[PDB]
Write a protein that binds this ligand. Structure first.
Ligand SMILES: CO[C@@]1(C(=O)Nc2cncc3ccccc23)CCOc2ccc(Cl)cc21
Ligand SMILES: CO[C@@]1(C(=O)Nc2cncc3ccccc23)CCOc2ccc(Cl)cc21
Lengths: 305, 300
């Protein structure tokens, strides 16, 4: 019993974190095989950030301008190139701790673990979701750029996020490991803002199934709803639309608890329209949307890596 | 910016998790140097659990009755001894992945990371606090016994908890790594219950200081309180008493934000009286008590 916000074990990623220094700037890099990946903004001064021409700034750098430190060992950079907003530093040593890995681009609503790092040293691990507005509500201080987000599927690490920026509201923006930003963000010090966000409906439903599995049933009711009527209510409360794909994905949890997905939607509708009435669900007074249906099944079944 | 419930990176502990099997029972063990630590209840059958005589059950076991698996490698048990409620299995191989470590017994209110494991394989990592009633609100299924709690301040892993039991309310009980239970619990299936839980007041105050550091001030007020008047109020909401030690520990956060500890106590009293009025503090509609003053300074 019990239901916690749980991250994947971070060991496979810890063995890939390195420190990347370019001039006065130090941030984190991900060392996989003979390449160190890091935000291309590592080459910018604060003035360069105002309006950077990354190709022009990079052409002025040599391999020896990039200092890469893996623990207490300096790696030698033997090549450098840019792919979108990520800088790829070729090094002369393949990382012996390189796990089985893939680069995957996730969709909003998907969760992942973040290994927050400073000076190439892991500091903490937490779980978060890619918001519908493409930001993450992370916890990152100055020096955290290059920290990565990942999932583990069997023995394979799927890297899905690299940290680049903090927006004025304190939320975060980054790229996939191919350097493509999540969201309409750019790696430039210019006015940017997180758009209006919405709640990840399928994840709230998954978390309500988790509460039922853990013995919390007060919110259940005799009612059901149509998918269209539920989506009218979801639109009203700034919840993401629930698709037939979401309903299908919740099938296993629906079969286990005996509560049809549309039956759980009618519980959610009542919670949106009436609140919790002083009660809590899994120790929360808010509807939690950072557990996917897969996270709920994994946590309630004890999947290992 | 941002404030998350953050666990320590688990890699140093992942490299210590092994599977321990004794007869029909399989659970997790912690392999440090040439010793594998695990709950002594691994030697019990479901029947033995009501009134086990562990000394008598253990004397009947030989080294070959314990199967220890580290990944896909079977380790050879060359000795076994019990220390309180933990079984220590001496093995013929020192763990090459043994980090710098220590065993520390924590106090209620302290937080730690749990690396939940099944069959010697890590499943996930999360952050816990030792509740005032000596239980932890974990996430543990059957097979999770032997999973450990730890902190990693400055490259040294301080192991503070080993999982042993789930109480009827779904909360969890365990021991330190010397096998001493936290709380009045025993490793037997006799009727046991978690005592009435209370809120960790010093941690709620630390988290309010985290909220001020992150730019939120809506809950502040023009009032202060005496420590005794605060405790008289807080006790009515099932909050733990705030001691002068707690006030001293909050000194650094008080100096950084410019909000005296007793001024923050007055904000807490008001929050308990009013609720949040539809507002949130650091993304929460409840007062969070699983961040210590040390955690707040580390993260902010
Ligand atoms: C590279 O630095 C920037 C940044 O956001 N960095 C940070 C990222 N995370 C947490 C931060 C906490 C505090 C201070 C900075 C943080 C700030 C300057 O302008 C920009 C502009 C664009 C980009 Cl892609 C990054 C940056
Ligand atoms: C030895 O296992 C017991 C147990 O609590 N195990 C568990 C520990 N964690 C999570 C659990 C989730 C679901 C099922 C059991 C769990 C159950 C029998 O009585 C007892 C009595 C004492 C002790 Cl020290 C352990 C136990």
């Amino acid at each position: 019993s019990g239901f916690r916000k749980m991250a994947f074990p971070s060991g496979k990623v810890e063995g890939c974190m390195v420190q990347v220094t370019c001039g006065t700037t130090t941030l984190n890099g991900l060392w996989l095989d003979d390449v160190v990946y890091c935000p291309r903004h590592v080459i910018c001064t604060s003035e360069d950030m105002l309006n950077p021409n990354y190709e022009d700034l990079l052409i002025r750098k040599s391999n020896h301008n990039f200092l890469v430190q893996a623990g207490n060992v300096q790696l030698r950079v033997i090549g450098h190139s840019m792919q979108n907003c990520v800088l790829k530093l070729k090094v002369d040593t393949a990382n012996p701790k390189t796990p089985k890995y893939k680069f995957v681009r996730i969709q909003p609503g998907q969760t992942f673990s973040v290994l927050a790092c400073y000076n190439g040293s892991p500091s903490g691990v937490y779980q978060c979701a890619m918001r519908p507005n493409f930001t993450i509500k992370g916890s990152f201080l100055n020096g955290s750029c290059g920290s990565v987000g990942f999932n583990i599927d069997y023995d394979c690490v799927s890297f899905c996020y690299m940290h680049h920026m903090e927006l004025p509201t304190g939320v975060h923006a980054g790229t996939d490991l191919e350097g493509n930003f999540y969201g309409p963000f750019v790696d430039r010090q210019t006015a940017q803002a997180a758009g209006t966000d919405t709640t990840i409906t399928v994840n709230v439903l998954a978390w309500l199934y988790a509460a039922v599995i853990n013995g919390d049933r007060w919110f259940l009711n005799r009612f059901t709803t149509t998918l269209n009527d539920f989506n009218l209510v979801a639109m009203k409360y700034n919840y993401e639309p629930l698709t037939q794909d979401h309903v299908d994905i919740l099938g296993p949890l629906s079969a286990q608890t005996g509560i049809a997905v549309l039956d759980m939607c009618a519980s959610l509708k009542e919670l949106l329209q009436n609140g919790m009435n002083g009660r809590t669900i899994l120790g929360s007074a808010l509807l939690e949307d950072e557990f996917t249906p897969f996270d709920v099944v994994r946590q309630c079944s004890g999947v290992t890596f």
